[PDB]
Assembly symmetry: T
Homo-oligomer: 155 residues x 12
């Protein structure tokens, strides 16, 4: 069936490509947060183990919300290691950092997702895509709140 | 008491007029979806009976949310067959279509509500009615998601 | 597939027609109650907004129970503005009455549905349809209880 | 202690005999539905696995309700394979039919329980056993609704 | 506001008189059960303290259902010691019986409520009061089930 | 088995007699509140129907708490119309008052239960029965709160 | 095709064993349900409740066993004729005294355990850890239930 | 650690200052509503005690949402009587007004918070802070809805 | 309608004045705890954010309980910034202390409320106001428990 | 930090010593009740297994409440077999008594805890420790209720 | 601190290596299942969208359970695209297959995880690591149940 | 009534003896963990007060499960201070250690329970007691996970 939602196909394609980067960054942050949840040690173990659990649980919902918007626009949602590695701007961490460096990297990760979200708003400038704008806004809100909670631990 | 929310009376009346159309389209889609929930048959009965139930349950809440926004603007919320027949832009189905045609009509219905919402946005941008703009945005999100799920069923 | 539930097709058709009137009245009362929920004002706002919400929430379940009995008898459940306007005996209200008149109209609405339910029992005279009789009975119970609560508000 | 509930002992015995047949048929349909839940295959697996689960869960409660009514009347509730094989009127399926034949058999099973309940009503009318009549009415309501949902799957 | 539910005033008064007897019986059995819950002793303490709690909790709801039906018919619901002592057919117990005698009295109490309910049906048939008949039927179901559970405790 | 809880039998009997009056008053107020819940009419119907429901639901628990304290002291809990009518100081209402008179009577009923509870403390002053004193105090707290809510409606 | 490391002949033999376990469990389920309805005497309330807990558990157990048969690629039996043929539970067509009901339910638990024990040799030279775990869980439940039941028969 | 969220420090500080105003107005409305909840009397006591409770419960959560956005921007959230008395535009009520005047003051309070929120959008437009704009919009929605419910109570 | 709860009007006014001070101290501590919840930083952020949330949630219930007792006694409950600043003995904190100083101040706050509660018991000496005494006792219990939890962090 | 709760250190130490005896008695009764829950047999198994579970579940909460009051007073809470064996006045039971003797011992245990609690009030007379007095009162209330339920099982 | 759980360090390292492969396969199947959930179309959309959601939700918990057993053994849990792509034996799908091919690939994926689990059991039997053996048993149970449900759709 | 669950009386007695040691160790760890929950202080108070609460709550359930398995085998479950002191291999702490020493003792306590469990498997293999072996395996899983979380705090 045709897709008749007030956005041309070329614009929908461009928006889906932007949201694909957002999905890749969100998913990459999801796994890094999960990773640090398992692997953190030291006197902050209990508090960070729990904090990182709350974060990755939220990000698992977020990846669905972003993927579903891509589908609503009429495009497949990427979902493989190869696709996400190509699309993601998150810095990979292959070892086990000290707890304070884990915190720092997760702050940087929140800010990287915000930066990707901000990069999509220009694609919406000439277009009427209020739902996508709202999704970007909700993601920025969560990541900016999470950045505050994380960087507070480093004070 | 006067209404002092940063939107003048003429503009609030115009927003209420638009939301009355959105309310009527949402209600018409609600009743059509409820109808199809009762009346669908064929091998997809269990999946569509359930899917249409989720949809009309969500739409019943949306009807309340739209009507309450009209009230917050200072105007009566329409709520009769006669009013909704005039205000709506969705054709009702008077018979019992095959399941695939029911699906197609509900795709078109989602898009008709999005189209009505789209007709109201320029007014909201002009007068800066941020809460109504957010309401319309949420409706567009829901309807565009539901259109994806429905049309997916028609793919080969 | 054949329907073999101890009621012949001609009787099932007649009972389904009667229940179609009950469905239309119940749905029309549902929307009127929803309408008054949004639109009531005055010192009784909070209590009537809440009371009417309880009522239309219940009526939304009731319309399913009625429509599903029609389907069990082997007939399509009506569900459009045109079909309900034709079948309904509820008096339409296109304006915004005072709170006390909203209450009076909803009492009349309860009693109108009861009258419609009572009108169906003769169709069951010569047939064995205990489930339909029970459905009518349950609706009469709910509407008679609601009528007491509503009219109590109009006493001194 | 004496049982003084307005029905004499011989009539209570007769009602308990009838309910024993209804219990056996309900239990036979319960086990058949549970069987088909485990064993159904094909593209309708997910939806029929779930649909049949809802049905056998409901029937498990019904068997308790029927057995407890026999106890209230002063008689033991039958509860063995031998008793249910004798008292039932539903043929069990010993193999694994295709999904559409499973559905067809469950339609016929609902109608079989209705037919057994129908066989008991003249006695209940004669001795005015209101609680048992209401129990049979609820069972007919459930089975007739379930028959609609099942046979709908066999339509085009 | 008038009551127009298909039953004339003198007939509604007659139904309310019957239900006032049923309410008084039910409330008196409620307090007796509550009393025995507090006061039972012996090796059956835990089981009877719990069983009686379940019963009086249910009866507290039932007294509401009965009182509300009286109100729906247009009459005040009795609710004093003097009114219930006058209307009730339950035997008063001013002491603390042995556990087995408490059980026996509670069996008789269930049957007293059933007997009152059974006396009301002919009037309901005459004037076609279907909701009240269903109320009576549901109470008979609960009380006849409870009588079975209670008297079972007295067997060998 | 003997009762050895630090209170002699004659004192326990006297305390149980006082609590029997409290139980009778509480139960009589319970039924009056239930009665007015069914029978109230007028423009306050919805609010008073609900308010009175909350009150009699609470009173149903209270009668259990009082009866169980009587049992813990080693005495039977009264539980019949004749016993409560004999013991109760609540004024009986055989008709259907107007809503404002229902409210007034329920205020008086709360205050009557408080008066009965207060009448028991002198007995405890001699004996040291801390759990009974606490029960009386809880009942006074509830009834004094409820009296405020009720009389506010009449302001 | 089914490639879970077992091979169809062993899957068939294990499924036959689990078919006996299913029949015994289902037959005990119905017998427990029967005794729940039909028990009388001073133990009525406690046995009515105890037997309800047991048959509620067994209703879940029959699903767990049937699903394992399906995972092994065989149909789950489910008729009176099939269960009469497969089951080793002693049938009871009357209404025993409460103490004899308890005794028969003890014997029923032990019969299910005996059937479960008979299946473990079918898992020699097979890698079927999930079936072994299922048998183990059923033995745990029935051995616990047997203790609770036989405790009622002690002096 | 640096804050790199696409908004420079000077603009974050200015937005946080605006949100500090909103927090103070929300908290002052919270305390006023809580106060009126305790102190309201008259025949509307039950309805207003409950309505004001729902409002202050909601506002207790709202102050968290606003305070947390201030923290996300990198600034401390004000939280003392001195700070809120200074920052707020809402005149507190030091006495116990009649119920109608409590309602009127709470309507005015909703509109004062809305006015404060509307005062912040100009800053956000120039700098692009979408999350803060969404927070403002959500608060405006709640307060405009609440203003409708409150002022409805004052109608004739 | 008159208030007849066994306490004369002059005594009720005196008790209500005492409770007004308790309300003001409890509310001031409520807002200080809420403040520190938002504003705390450092490695204890997660645990103190949560701990302070539990505390202010409890104090919000407590201010209702205290205010409602004032209303039950027949007097208006105070509820403005000016009324509470006038009545409160809590030391105000206009800045953002280090986490350890936040903890110390919250210990002091618990002890200040206890002090205010203790100051009211003499009024209840000549007068029998058992519900108010119980309310004071419950507040002291809660605040003394909270003080232990807080000061343990500084050990 | 200093402890400034209006009780001097020497008095807090004496109160903590009394509460340590209460904690030891409560914990010893907790384990004895848990023991009897596992080990009871006979026709009362189901009712006593359950009753003792309710009791030990409550006692597990109480040991926390008592221990936390010791900590609030500024002293360590004892928590070892040696510490409790030294402090406890409960009679130890190393075997498996008959069910009636288990009940009797648990009655004696409730009364022993009450005796210990009562022994502490003299300390609180000279001092002002209202929270500790309330804790003692709540424990006495629970143990006196439980003693009634237990000894009722031993009545004729 | 020493790890003294009855398994020597070299053996724990070898078990962790095997569990790292199992984690990688489970995570790859998790993402593939999540992918197919978003991207499936055709008349089976509703049923497969829901079924695949149930599966990936379960796998998300399983990933946690496997990773935390690795931690309990004293080794870091791998958690990056590069690590999983190196360790995983699952075939990734970079396109959008038809619904029946998605089902077939998910059947293969269940059987692939079972193969990996089966390859680890000999080490666990040699070492007597009973908790890890139970974990692998539960994974085999779930994947074998899931394989039945999936392949039933293709009959 | 006889016990016929496929294990002879002397072998059941031997299993019950092993489980009696396991029960005693689990109960001793339960009380030590409960003690440390009450008594821990210092900057880790919030995280350890909570962590130790979760642990003792879980252990309270574990003692029931172990005790009930002894009963299912036909033997009394030990349940006194004297029995547990005799049977237990955990040394109790009579004082109030620093938080880090509390953590270390609780790690050693987890490993002590595991050590007792491991000693019992040869008997269970010999007589084929599968339910007891699963119980031991579940306890080892919990204790090995808990040891990891505890010792991580010391890194
Ligand atoms: Cl995101
Ligand atoms: Cl990054
Ligand atoms: Cl919409
Ligand atoms: Cl359309
Ligand atoms: Cl009408
Ligand atoms: Cl209706
Ligand atoms: Cl049936
Ligand atoms: Cl059939
Ligand atoms: Cl009744
Ligand atoms: Cl009687
Ligand atoms: Cl009271
Ligand atoms: Cl009075
Ligand atoms: Cl089994
Ligand atoms: Cl057997
Ligand atoms: Cl204002
Ligand atoms: Cl706000
Ligand atoms: Cl306080
Ligand atoms: Cl301070
Ligand atoms: Cl205690
Ligand atoms: Cl003792
Ligand atoms: Cl896995
Ligand atoms: Cl694969
Ligand atoms: Cl353990
Ligand atoms: Cl150790
Ligand atoms: Na999804
Ligand atoms: Na609404
Ligand atoms: Na429906
Ligand atoms: Na039952
Ligand atoms: Na009621
Ligand atoms: Na009770
Ligand atoms: Na199943
Ligand atoms: Na917060
Ligand atoms: Na309040
Ligand atoms: Na604790
Ligand atoms: Na985890
Ligand atoms: Na237990």
């Amino acid at each position: 069936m045709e897709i008749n939602i007030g956005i041309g196909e070329q614009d929908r394609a461009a928006i889906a490509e932007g949201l694909s980067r957002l999905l890749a960054d969100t998913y990459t942050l999801y796994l890094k947060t999960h990773n640090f949840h398992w692997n953190v040690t030291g006197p902050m173990f209990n508090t960070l183990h729990l904090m990182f659990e709350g974060q990755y649980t939220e990000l698992a919902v977020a990846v669905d919300d972003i993927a579903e918007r891509i589908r609503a626009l009429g495009f497949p949602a990427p979902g493989t290691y190869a696709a996400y590695a190509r699309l993601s701007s998150i810095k990979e961490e292959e070892g086990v950092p000290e707890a304070e460096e884990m915190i720092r990297q997760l702050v940087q990760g929140q800010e990287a997702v915000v930066r990707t979200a901000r990069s999509i708003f220009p694609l919406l400038d000439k277009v009427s895509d209020e739902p996508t704008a709202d999704l970007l806004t909700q993601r920025m809100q969560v990541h900016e709140k999470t950045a505050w909670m994380l960087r507070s631990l480093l004070a």
